[PDB]
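User: Is it possible to get a 3D structure for a protein together with its bound compound? The compound here is chloride ion. I've pasted both below.
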Amino acid sequence: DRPRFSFSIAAREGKARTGTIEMKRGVIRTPAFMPVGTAATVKALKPETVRATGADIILGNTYHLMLRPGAERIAKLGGLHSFMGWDRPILTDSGGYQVMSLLTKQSEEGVTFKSRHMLSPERSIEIQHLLGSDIVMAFDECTPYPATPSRAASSMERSMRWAKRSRDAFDSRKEQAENAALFGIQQGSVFENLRQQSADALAEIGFDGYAVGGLAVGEGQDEMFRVLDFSVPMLPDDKPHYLMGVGKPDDIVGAVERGIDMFDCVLPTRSGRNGQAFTWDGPINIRNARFSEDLKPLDSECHCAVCQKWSRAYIHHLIRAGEILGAMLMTEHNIAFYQQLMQKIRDSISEGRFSQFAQDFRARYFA
Amino acid sequence: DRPRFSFSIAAREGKARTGTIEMKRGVIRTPAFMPVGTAATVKALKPETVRATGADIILGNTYHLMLRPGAERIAKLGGLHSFMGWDRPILTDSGGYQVMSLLTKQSEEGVTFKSRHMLSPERSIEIQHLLGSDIVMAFDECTPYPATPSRAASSMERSMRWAKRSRDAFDSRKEQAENAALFGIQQGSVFENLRQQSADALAEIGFDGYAVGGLAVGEGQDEMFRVLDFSVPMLPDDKPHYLMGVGKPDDIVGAVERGIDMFDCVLPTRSGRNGQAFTWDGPINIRNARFSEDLKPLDSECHCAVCQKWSRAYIHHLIRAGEILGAMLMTEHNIAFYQQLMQKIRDSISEGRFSQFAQDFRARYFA
Ligand SMILES: Nc1nc2cc3[nH]c(NCCN4CCOCC4)nc3cc2c(=O)[nH]1
Ligand SMILES: Nc1nc2cc3[nH]c(NCCN4CCOCC4)nc3cc2c(=O)[nH]1
Ligand SMILES: [Cl-]
Ligand SMILES: [Cl-]
Ligand SMILES: [Zn+2]
Ligand SMILES: [Zn+2]
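Assistant: Yes, that's possible. Here is the predicted structure of the complex:
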């Protein structure tokens, strides 16, 4: 029987690592990409299809699920896993990014938003328990970008107080503490000293894993990478590092080069439904007239079921026609592509050729 | 190797028949229900899923496909089967029902509609060839309901002239004549004498199968059944009888009792996406608040993959949220339900207990 939580690093190359997280509901291969299932569904895919693409874990959201269908309701129905039919690990965000994204009244106690609903470290942790989340995220505040050093510091300090409250709420619930894991979230905007203070605070509290929060909020890749350069080494080496909300394939590769182990983003799903398909030669927009009679699959090397069977021409027709099958096929391919990217990353680190892979990947993707 | 077309009747009970149509691309068990795939997709389902529900054949549409993505385009891409990934038989309607349903200029030559597109017996048959249809429908005119006897007669007479033109166009195309089948369509509105004249004309021309056209156009079940009572026996007994656009489960049962072998309708797909699920105890609307915490499957006996795995409560959430997976699950279940209905019909006729099945079905469905 697998443990509640165990992270093991099998191979390294520079700051990059590959390994596994073992949890009760399954093993997660790292670096990992988590498809997003915000509304208790990875949009347009059955869970069996999500798994077939190679996903080990999916992401859910405290904020969205507390609104619809409700956290207490999901608990009454047996929990999120049973509800949606995904029996493997689920990581849930805490609501902290909705603390600035989707009327709000903020205080030291938490955030109320408008019917009116409240979130606090205690309520967020409770909701994640009711959902039966395997990886629970601390309740934080994603500092807006740009932020002044003073505002970034005040925000980060509140988040660290909330991180301690999250830890205590989680630990006070025996079933949760014994069966789930808790990750802390580093804040501090783009400021090295604040990132260090945040890392120190989180490590003092102690978590099963550490997220880099407050990025992928409009800063751009150069700045994100600059912040990762100094921020990731501040986190405990022996625990997973999770970069929230990232990202494009090149963002993922560069983040892995900087020590990140876990990723999530809506890009493959959302942009798939909008007609964007990922390929090793860069993204294409399948709606473009140039694809109307193209018999080739979305990508020439992709091993997914979509690329085995259907042409660009057919998918072009479906997306132009607003057909549901178009969304289904685009999404399955994009998620499969993302998982294949993660597999190539894992294999190349394992073989000590990740730097070469990154270079080759970029040369072709951006040709 | 299967023949171009062979219909064999294995068992009878009153006017009801069960048997098989053998065609080059596969066997069709009758009575048969054909899922509708108007836009080169059965909405929200992969072809493999359509097949898994038990479908032997699907329906496409000359009118819709000639507009998008285009008949010549589909031919250039290898035909409709290859295009959409369904390798079994496809029946295509001729456009004759759009001749009154979806600006139009009608003449003895055909129908022009507005870009401008033309349909005639010759062009309809040609389009169906370009698509690579297995069962080609004659180009007709679905007489509006209600119709005066004079107007119904004039319309029917034109349709019979068009049926002869359809026959000749089909026969003049060697590859089509050798590999596909051609069905004629009976018209005559609700008038017995006109239905007889139409049947006589079609039988004189000679077809592989015979559709009852001009019904399911607002007349209601009592009147439809009254017309079927005298119309079906006018058609050749040794060929399939196809009731176009029907229908609700009770309509199908009653039509089989009256000698119909083939059916199509958008009800399971369209109403599925709208939240209506078919059950042996009658349809339910899954959006209803009463289902919000109902852990039972859509139907208590249904053997489909949806009912094996997901609850009413989950599907209720998905449909209320406008989630694509909701459409996918509802549609798969409804099409599976329809196929299970057809299987029960076939088995009960084979066993000489169809009358009892019809009675039992109705008692429970309408309880
Ligand atoms: N709790 C918590 N969650 C986070 C989630 C984040 N997501 C992102 N970036 C991506 C934002 N997406 C872009 C696509 O539309 C939806 C929002 N950046 C994120 C940062 C955080 C964070 O600091 N805290
Ligand atoms: N060529 C041809 N096709 C037919 C198709 C028919 N469909 C129906 N009834 C169902 C109509 N649906 C109802 C759901 O919305 C779409 C149209 N009735 C139909 C009658 C005909 C017909 O006489 N000729
Ligand atoms: Cl999405
Ligand atoms: Cl439909
Ligand atoms: Zn693919
Ligand atoms: Zn079912």
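The interface with chain A takes residues 39-41, 43-46, 68-69, 73, 76-78, 83-85, 292-293, 295, 309-311, 313-314, 317-318, 320-321, 323-325, 327-328 of chain B (CB under 8 Å). Chain B is about 45% helix and 15% strand.
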